[PDB]
Structures are given as structure tokens and as C-alpha cells.
């Protein structure tokens, strides 16, 4: 009974990072080493655990969070990072246990003339808490002066399109990201690595 990771990794379209998606995985066998050894992934980093240890553990639930960012932002998907993505879009806890997986999606997510579907949040009053998801669309008040519903000096719309084009440099090309996190409850532990099956 293999975990349906394909539904996440091979989805036709991914979420915008500000509106990142979460898939719950349960009641299945996960081969984390097979994922780790896939040449399809250019980023594969685990925190608080390794793929070998995950192959020998059972969890109640696994969460697969997925979204698109630009290449030069991939380094922000890690504990203790700063930047617009870590601060305002998708935040991992300092004590994160899990894995960050990423791959270049230029062939899927860029379009001649721009793919404007993918957004990120450029401004926020405070930093996100870990695993917080903010889909609000109020004017960002950058200074002490209220905006009163009008954009202008220090009054900005908080979301921004990437506009991915295939001729962008790699730092500006789209990357698909999957973050795996792990939950243990006082309940049957139905997601296991192959060694603990």
C-alpha cells in the first residue's frame, strides 16, 4: 500500500506560495530513501531526522506542503532563514523535523509572455508563525499614515506576480517545492517507512 506521493509531486499545477497547499498522507508505506535518491529533485534536505531514520519510523499523519517560488528563493525554505518567502509566505519552525524537496519547473510553469498565475506576498505587518497561511488582500500600510483604501506612498497592494517566462535566468525560473512534516498522535500510526512495516 504505497503512499500516493505522485498526487503531490506530479500535480499538473501547484499553489502560489502565499496560498500554499497541504496534502495529508495516511495509511500507507513511504520509501523516503527512494524519494531522496531520485535525480528528479535538485534540492532534498532533511532536518531533525534523515531519510534512513524515516525509513525506520511510523507516524499518524504526514503532511506534504507544495507551492512554487523562484529559484533564488529556494534557500529560504529552511529553518532560521529570512527574506520575503520565509518572513511573509511560508515559515518553518526553528526545531523543524522533516524534509524540503525542490526541482526546476521552468518547462511546466513558465509561458512565453509570462505566466502571471503564481503570486507571492511582498509585504506584511509581522512575520508569519511556522506553518501559518495568510491569503488576505488588504492594502499594506508601510508607514504611520493610514491608507484609507487608497494605494500610494507607503500604501501598497501586498501580492506580486512572478510573471515566469522560459528565458528568465535560473534565479528567476520557477521551482516546485514539497515540504514533508510528521505528526504523532495517540491514534494508530499508519504511515511507516519500509523497515518498520
Amino acid at each position: 500500500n504505497l503512499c500516493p506521493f505522485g498526487e503531490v509531486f506530479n500535480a499538473t499545477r501547484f499553489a502560489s506560495v502565499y496560498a500554499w497547499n497541504r496534502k495529508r498522507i495516511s495509511n500507507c508505506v513511504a520509501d523516503y530513501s527512494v524519494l531522496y535518491n531520485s535525480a528528479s529533485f535538485s534540492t532534498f534536505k532533511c532536518y531533525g531526522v534523515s531519510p534512513t531514520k524515516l525509513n525506520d519510523l511510523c507516524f499518524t499523519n504526514v503532511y506534504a506542503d507544495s507551492f512554487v517560488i523562484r529559484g533564488d528563493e529556494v534557500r529560504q525554505i529552511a529553518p532560521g532563514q529570512t527574506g520575503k518567502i520565509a518572513d511573509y509566505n511560508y515559515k518553518l519552525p526553528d526545531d523543524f523535523t522533516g524534509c524540503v524537496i525542490a526541482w526546476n519547473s521552468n518547462n511546466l510553469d513558465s509561458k512565453v509572455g509570462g505566466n502571471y498565475n503564481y503570486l507571492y506576498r511582498l509585504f506584511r505587518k509581522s512575520n508569519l508563525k511556522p506553518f501559518e497561511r495568510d491569503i488576505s488582500t488588504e492594502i499594506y500600510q508601510a508607514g504611520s499614515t493610514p491608507c484609507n483604501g487608497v494605494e500610494g506612498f507607503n500604501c501598497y497592494f501586498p501580492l506580486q506576480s512572478y510573471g515566469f517566462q522560459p528565458t528568465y535566468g535560473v534565479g528567476y525560473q520557477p521551482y516546485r517545492v514539497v515540504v514533508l512534516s510528521f505528526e504523532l498522535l495517540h491514534a494508530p500510526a499508519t504511515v511507516c517507512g519500509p523497515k518498520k512495516s
Epitope: 509585504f123 488588504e138 492594502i139 487608497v150 501598497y156 497592494f157 506580486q160 510573471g163
Partner: nanobody, 127 residues
Framework: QVQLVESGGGLVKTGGSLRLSCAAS????????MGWFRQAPGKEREFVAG????????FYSDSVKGRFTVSRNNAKDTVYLHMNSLKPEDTAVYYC????????????????????WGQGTQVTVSS
């Protein structure tokens, strides 16, 4: 592409007021941000003012800020350009349109970002 039904405009004296309307059935204006543009003979089509799809943000070119206002009805199907303190320099063909492109800085919008253009309506301000 959607149909935007644009109306209003005409001849007004310097210092006067006009209202332009842009209507679209159902959820169009609550889905896509809108802009008002204008074009004088032999000049480029320039951004005037707009409203985010949210209905809670409006924004204005430096040429019209403090004189023009954008509003949207409760139904969210009709957007208005309230043109006050009109000057001869405001004489142009005015257009409404919508964009799928989200720019955090509205100051970066151009006509290339917009589509589903309304029919242009003449505004003429005479001294």
C-alpha cells in the same frame, strides 16, 4: 475575454464633473482588478485610475489624484469614474479594462497588462 459595457462622457466646462460607468455581469469585477485609461489624439493610451478586485483599494495617476475617484456599487457589477475639477488637459477617449496581472506597485501598470477593453468614450473639457 469578457464584455465590459462602458457609458457616460460628453462635453463639460472647465471645473465641471462627469461620471463614466463600466458594467460587467456577475463576478467579473470581484475577480479581476480594473483600470481606467485615456488616449488623446496622436498620444499613447495612459493609466488614469483603477480598483483592485477586492473593491477596498483604489489608485490614481499623479495627473488625476485628488480630482477623480473610482467607486463600485454594492452588487460589485458596476465601476464608476467620478471626474471632478475637469481641465482641458483631461480631454481624451476614456476606456475601462481588466487585468489578470497582480502588481504590488500599481505605478507599474501599463495598457499592455489590460484586456476586455470597453468601448472608448469621448470626454471633452472646453474653456
Amino acid at each position: 475575454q469578457v464584455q465590459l459595457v462602458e457609458s457616460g462622457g460628453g462635453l463639460v466646462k472647465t471645473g465641471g464633473s462627469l461620471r463614466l460607468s463600466c458594467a460587467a455581469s456577475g463576478r467579473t469585477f470581484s475577480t479581476y482588478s480594473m483600470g481606467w485609461f485615456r488616449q488623446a489624439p496622436g498620444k499613447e493610451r495612459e493609466f488614469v485610475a483603477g480598483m483592485r478586485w477586492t473593491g477596498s483599494s483604489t489608485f490614481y495617476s499623479d495627473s488625476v489624484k485628488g480630482r477623480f475617484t473610482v467607486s463600485r456599487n454594492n452588487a460589485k457589477d458596476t465601476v464608476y469614474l467620478h471626474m471632478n475639477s475637469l481641465k482641458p488637459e483631461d480631454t481624451a477617449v476614456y476606456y475601462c479594462a481588466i487585468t489578470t496581472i497582480v502588481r504590488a506597485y500599481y505605478t507599474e501598470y501599463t495598457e499592455a497588462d489590460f484586456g476586455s477593453w470597453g468601448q472608448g468614450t469621448q470626454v471633452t473639457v472646453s474653456s
